[PDB]
Amino acid sequence: ALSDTQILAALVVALLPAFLAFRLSTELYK
Amino acid sequence: ALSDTQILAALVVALLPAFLAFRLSTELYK
Amino acid sequence: MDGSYAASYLPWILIPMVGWLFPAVTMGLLFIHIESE
Amino acid sequence: MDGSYAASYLPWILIPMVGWLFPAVTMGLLFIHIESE
Amino acid sequence: SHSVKIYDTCIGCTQCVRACPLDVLEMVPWDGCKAAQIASSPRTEDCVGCKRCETACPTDFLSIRVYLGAETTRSMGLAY
Amino acid sequence: EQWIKDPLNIRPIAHAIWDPHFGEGAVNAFTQAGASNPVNIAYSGVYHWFYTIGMTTNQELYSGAVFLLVLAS
Amino acid sequence: LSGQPPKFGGSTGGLLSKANREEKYAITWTSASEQVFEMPTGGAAIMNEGENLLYLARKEQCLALGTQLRTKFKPKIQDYKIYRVYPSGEVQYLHPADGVFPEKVNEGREAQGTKTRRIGQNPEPVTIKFSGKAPYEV
Amino acid sequence: NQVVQAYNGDPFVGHLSTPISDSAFTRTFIGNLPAYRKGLSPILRGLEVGMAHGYFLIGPWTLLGPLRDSEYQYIGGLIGALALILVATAALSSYGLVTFQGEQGSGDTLQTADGWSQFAAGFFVGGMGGAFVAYFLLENLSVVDGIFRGLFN
Amino acid sequence: NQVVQAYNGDPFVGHLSTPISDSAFTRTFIGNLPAYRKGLSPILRGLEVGMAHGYFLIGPWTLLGPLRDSEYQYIGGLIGALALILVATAALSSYGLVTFQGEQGSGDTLQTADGWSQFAAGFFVGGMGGAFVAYFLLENLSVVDGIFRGLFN
Ligand code: CLA
Ligand code: CLA
Ligand code: CLA
Ligand code: CLA
Ligand code: CLA
Ligand code: CLA
Ligand SMILES: CC1=C(/C=C/C(C)=C/C=C/C(C)=C/C=C/C=C(C)/C=C/C=C(C)/C=C/C2=C(C)CCCC2(C)C)C(C)(C)CCC1
Ligand SMILES: CC1=C(/C=C/C(C)=C/C=C/C(C)=C/C=C/C=C(C)/C=C/C=C(C)/C=C/C2=C(C)CCCC2(C)C)C(C)(C)CCC1
Ligand code: SF4
Numbered sequence: 184a185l186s187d188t189q190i191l192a193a194l195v196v197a198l199l200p201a202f203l204a205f206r207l208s209t210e211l212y213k
Numbered sequence: 214a215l216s217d218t219q220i221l222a223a224l225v226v227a228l229l230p231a232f233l234a235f236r237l238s239t240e241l242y243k
Numbered sequence: 244m245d246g247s248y249a250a251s252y253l254p255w256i257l258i259p260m261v262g263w264l265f266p267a268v269t270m271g272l273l274f275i276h277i278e279s280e
Numbered sequence: 281m282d283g284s285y286a287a288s289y290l291p292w293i294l295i296p297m298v299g300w301l302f303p304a305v306t307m308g309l310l311f312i313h314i315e316s317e
Numbered sequence: 318s319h320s321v322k323i324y325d326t327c328i329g330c331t332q333c334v335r336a337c338p339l340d341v342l343e344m345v346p347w348d349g350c351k352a353a354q355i356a357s358s359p360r361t362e363d364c365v366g367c368k369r370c371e372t373a374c375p376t377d378f379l380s381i382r383v384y385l386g387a388e389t390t391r392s393m394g395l396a397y
Numbered sequence: 398e399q400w401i402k403d404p405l406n407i408r409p410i411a412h413a414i415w416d417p418h419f420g421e422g423a424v425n426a427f428t429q430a431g432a433s434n435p436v437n438i439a440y441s442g443v444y445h446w447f448y449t450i451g452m453t454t455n456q457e458l459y460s461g462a463v464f465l466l467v468l469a470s
Numbered sequence: 471l472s473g474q475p476p477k478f479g480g481s482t483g484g485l486l487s488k489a490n491r492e493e494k495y496a497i498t499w500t501s502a503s504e505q506v507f508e509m510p511t512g513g514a515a516i517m518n519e520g521e522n523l524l525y526l527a528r529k530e531q532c533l534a535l536g537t538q539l540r541t542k543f544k545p546k547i548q549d550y551k552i553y554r555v556y557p558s559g560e561v562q563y564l565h566p567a568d569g570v571f572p573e574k575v576n577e578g579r580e581a582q583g584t585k586t587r588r589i590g591q592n593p594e595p596v597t598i599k600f601s602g603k604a605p606y607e608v
Numbered sequence: 609n610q611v612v613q614a615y616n617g618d619p620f621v622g623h624l625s626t627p628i629s630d631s632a633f634t635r636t637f638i639g640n641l642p643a644y645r646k647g648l649s650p651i652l653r654g655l656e657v658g659m660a661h662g663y664f665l666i667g668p669w670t671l672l673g674p675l676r677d678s679e680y681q682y683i684g685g686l687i688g689a690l691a692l693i694l695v696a697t698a699a700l701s702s703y704g705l706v707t708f709q710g711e712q713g714s715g716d717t718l719q720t721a722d723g724w725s726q727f728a729a730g731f732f733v734g735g736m737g738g739a740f741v742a743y744f745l746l747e748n749l750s751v752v753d754g755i756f757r758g759l760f761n
Numbered sequence: 762n763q764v765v766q767a768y769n770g771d772p773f774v775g776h777l778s779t780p781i782s783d784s785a786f787t788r789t790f791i792g793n794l795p796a797y798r799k800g801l802s803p804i805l806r807g808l809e810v811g812m813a814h815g816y817f818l819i820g821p822w823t824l825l826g827p828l829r830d831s832e833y834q835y836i837g838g839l840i841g842a843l844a845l846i847l848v849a850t851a852a853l854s855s856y857g858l859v860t861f862q863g864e865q866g867s868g869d870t871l872q873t874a875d876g877w878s879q880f881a882a883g884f885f886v887g888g889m890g891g892a893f894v895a896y897f898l899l900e901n902l903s904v905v906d907g908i909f910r911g912l913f914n
């Protein structure tokens with residue numbers, strides 16, 4: 184099986200592609 | 214012991230020093 | 244807080260009023276007053 | 281919908297958000313955006 | 318505003334008028350000393366009350382006095 | 398009324414505690430000097446002074462309190 | 471209020487809401503040489519060639535700036551003017567109120583703030599009781 | 609490539625144009641909160657501010673309160689939240705009575721006596737409504753759980 | 762030492778300046794009720810007037826009603842109070858529709874059609890909110906008693 188906190192760790196790690204995707208898409212919008 | 218209505222009688226009597234203290238303090242404020 | 248003495252409901256209503264209504268009303272009126280004009 | 285896997289509350293909160301909050305917020309922002317100026 | 322008063326014992330040494338940060342004071346002509354000048358306080362609504370003018374006065378006791386009073390925006394040194 | 402029976406044994410109660418913050422432990426701890434409510438033990442010595450100057454019933458103290466309300470008025 | 475502003479990068483020390491609700495102060499000085507001064511708000515700036523216009527929030531900051539313009543520069547900048555500008559719009563003229571700096575006797579100023587006695591002959595508060603005055607101003 | 613300029617091109621105001629204070633996302637987000645959004649009447653922005661805080665204030669006493677270990681767990685939280693929204697609206701209206709007595713312009717519709725009174729009214733309605741709707745979701749939590757999982761569908 | 766002068770220094774208006782009608786306490790108190798307080802928008806003064814009456818109207822049917830001797834004692838009082846606030850707001854809005862149809866000035870923001878409509882809206886919101894909050898305290902009376910005495914603390 185898999186741990187409870189590994190899922191939340193994956194979520195807080197994937198918060199970094201969220202920020203970088205937001206900033207890349209904003210910079211493409213220019 | 215003491216009565217239930219003697220306490221409320223004391224409260225409605227002490228409503229008179231409340232009014233006179235309010236009016237004395239207002240008159241001192243002049 | 245049971246009250247064995249006479250008129251035990253009277254502290255029940257007067258501790259909120261002297262604890263909240265008297266401070267909230269007095270500080271509200273004084274806040275309107277010291278900052279008026 | 282019981283969840284045997286780890287963090288079963290996580291789909292419980294993320295299916296409403298991706299189903300409603302993401303569409304309502306995204307269409308609201310895009311509706312303000314495509315109709316601005 | 319604070320009131321800055323200058324008394325007869327001024328020797329016109331100019332120390333107070335250049336020790337003052339806000340330049341409240343200024344020297345005016347006078348006939349009562351060798352230096353032929355006495356400090357005046359024209360723009361005394363700009364006095365903050367720092368008393369660097371009293372600190373710089375050499376005459377004893379003091380030829381310049383600051384008398385702290387009704388505070389304002391200018392006399393409290395508030396940038397906000 | 399109770400204190401002027403045996404003033405050596407009973408502690409004089411000043412007034413009653415009424416605050417909504419008390420837990421069960423504080424209510425049982427502050428129930429003292431023969432009361433049901435939580436009470437404060439009087440250390441001002443007004444009980445001894447009232448007992449010495451001849452006041453021996455709650456009605457005498459109530460009449461004194463109303464009289465002093467009228468005097469303050 | 472003519473003058474290009476100094477090349478300053480901005481700072482948190484500076485003009486609060488006091489500047490656009492009540493008075494703020496402008497110091498105007500002219501220098502030939504470009505150099506670096508310490509703003510009393512904190513930092514360092516660039517003196518432009520020619521006229522400068524620096525907006526500050528206190529008169530003490532303007533006079534502290536003018537003081538360091540006078541004493542910290544070998545080509546001393548003494549033609550500095552301090553204004554008090556209001557958000558309503560009008561501009562006052564404050565520090566060199568006469569022609570010459572306050573240390574020098576202009577011979578056309580008026581002796582105000584001068585008492586005709588020393589502190590020993592100051593009246594005493596018992597004489598002026600309930601008069602609405604105080605022992606200096608009598 | 610400097611990212612910290614002065615605020616709005618003014619180098620003597622006491623503010624820097626940092627990536628948090630004066631970014632594009634911050635301008636579009638802070639400038640679109642109800643306190644700053646353009647064109648709204650004060651009643652609707654006060655209403656939207658109020659609900660965001662009534663829904664918030666339910667939780668702290670619900671999970672951490674004198675009643676959190678009894679059967680009236682949510683009623684104590686709701687009572688505490690109504691107490692806090694009551695004193696919040698009293699403070700808001702007192703602030704309106706105090707600050708906006710000298711006559712001012714209408715550049716912003718919120719910074720005036722009528723505007724702040726509308727804001728306080730909207731804040732009260734929204735705050736008590738948000739508090740009661742969070743109480744209603746929390747009290748009927750079995751129902752919300754069952755409908756999000758599909759126990760009744 | 763005369764305490765009854767004419768009203769506002771005018772000896773021909775039909776009013777006396779008695780210690781009840783025109784005292785300092787009366788001026789500061791009547792003139793600071795929501796119907797007379799300065800600077801308020803009509804929505805907030807209507808809201809404050811409304812809550813003072815919704816909280817009031819709960820009691821008479823709760824303690825003296827056809828349902829006062831049943832298990833739905835407070836629901837009958839709440840239903841009666843909503844009926845009364847409904848007809849009160851209908852009367853208020855009808856009064857606004859009737860009185861403020863001929864165009865008038867804006868010396869007082871409450872005595873105009875938009876102002877009275879805002880007052881009626883605020884009165885409705887406040888009245889129903891005060892009625893429901895008095896119902897919520899009365900229905901959850903064991904909880905309020907226990908938290909004021911300390912049965913859960
Ligand atoms: C001297 C007055 C005094 C009194 C009487 C109280 C009493 C109370 N405190 Mg408080 N406290 C006080 C001073 C006081 N405190 C001070 C000075 C401090 C700061 C150190 C605190 C710090 C403190 C904290 C941090 C907390 C308490 C809490 C409690 C409450 C415990 C039970 C509860 O859940 O209540 C629930 C709340 C209430 C009963 C408030 C009244 C609100 C309801 C809705 C009644 C209003 C009715 C209606 C809406 C308006 C009617 C209008 C009227 C004219 C008819 C209790 C009522 C606890 C709590 O739950 O607080 C919410 C708690 O967490 N107190
Ligand atoms: C992909 C996302 C998705 C999800 C998660 C849902 C889920 C749901 N649908 Mg839906 N549906 C969707 C897409 C979705 N649907 C689409 C695309 C269609 C169109 C074909 C439909 C068509 C459909 C119909 C026609 C109906 C459902 C209904 C249902 C609900 C069944 C249980 C119920 O009574 O809920 C009750 C409702 C809710 C839980 C909605 C949430 C409202 C509460 C008050 C939560 C809000 C909390 C608070 C007020 C705000 C909080 C703010 C927050 C920031 C904290 C369930 C929640 C049924 C239903 O009852 O709908 C109401 C039903 O009749 N759906
Ligand atoms: C002291 C700190 C503290 C404490 C103890 C809590 C405690 C709580 N918060 Mg809170 N909160 C806090 C601080 C805190 N909060 C802070 C700092 C904020 C940010 C400002 C929040 C924001 C927040 C939100 C936004 C919500 C909570 C919720 C809750 C509750 C979740 C646990 C529970 O049993 O609810 C049971 C769990 C639920 C009821 C989950 C429901 C979640 C939503 C409604 C379902 C998804 C539907 C979707 C949003 C529908 C909207 C769109 C649709 C209309 C189309 C709990 C009482 C929830 C709450 O109050 O629910 C009533 C919740 O929604 N809080
Ligand atoms: C007998 C007249 C009367 C009555 C029934 C009320 C009734 C009420 N007013 Mg109040 N008000 C009055 C006169 C009165 N007002 C006066 C003379 C002033 C002018 C200073 C105010 C100014 C005032 C403010 C600024 C606000 C209220 C609001 C309220 C509501 C709940 C809070 C409150 O005051 O507790 C009930 C109070 C009493 C039973 C005693 C009333 C007498 C004092 C002077 C009230 C003072 C209020 C105080 C400044 C702040 C509220 C304290 C409260 C939160 C504990 C309620 C409808 C608040 C509200 O919810 O509005 C939307 C609000 O924001 N009032
Ligand atoms: C036909 C005449 C009549 C009748 C039968 C009643 C009957 C009732 N009234 Mg009412 N009332 C009337 C006329 C009448 N009223 C008049 C003429 C007015 C003046 C305009 C009032 C003003 C009045 C008030 C202001 C209140 C009552 C209350 C009540 C109830 C008290 C008895 C009970 O079981 O409540 C149980 C007793 C309580 C719930 C006591 C609670 C008292 C407060 C809320 C606790 C103290 C907390 C404090 C105020 C918090 C505020 C500040 C805080 C936020 C910081 C009862 C249903 C109370 C009520 O509706 O409560 C829901 C009450 O608060 N009435
Ligand atoms: C089909 C249209 C329709 C419907 C759904 C309603 C619905 C409503 N109106 Mg109404 N209204 C309408 C047309 C309608 N209106 C017309 C044509 C007039 C112009 C004369 C009014 C004028 C009117 C007033 C002045 C007020 C309402 C308000 C109300 C609300 C509750 C009271 C009520 O009227 O009972 C439900 C009524 C019906 C189902 C029948 C509607 C048709 C008649 C003509 C309504 C007449 C209302 C009457 C003058 C006073 C209300 C009576 C009520 C208290 C029993 C409710 C939302 C009141 C409210 O709460 O507003 C905040 C309010 O103050 N309305
Ligand atoms: C996102 C984000 C954020 C935020 C956070 C959060 C978490 C939020 C919160 C939120 C919230 C907090 C929300 C809430 C909501 C609410 C609601 C939605 C409510 C509603 C209400 C209602 C429903 C009401 C109504 C009513 C009733 C019911 C009755 C009474 C009256 C009235 C009418 C009013 C931040 C900043 C970080 C930034 C980033 C992003
Ligand atoms: C003092 C005085 C007086 C008076 C009397 C009395 C006794 C009064 C009454 C009072 C009252 C009668 C009060 C009341 C209060 C109320 C309240 C405080 C309420 C609140 C409300 C709320 C809470 C609401 C909210 C909401 C909700 C909940 C939901 C729905 C919606 C809304 C949002 C609205 C006289 C004249 C003699 C004069 C002298 C002094
Ligand atoms: S410092 Fe004193 S002595 Fe010197 S000029 Fe000023 S007042 Fe006169």
Ligand code: SF4
Binds near residue numbers: 364369
């Ligand atoms: S107190 Fe300070 S600012 Fe005022 S005149 Fe003296 S030295 Fe100048």
Ligand SMILES: [Ca+2]
Binds near residue numbers: 674675678913
């Ligand atoms: Ca507990």
Ligand SMILES: [Ca+2]
Binds near residue numbers: 826829830831
């Ligand atoms: Ca019956």
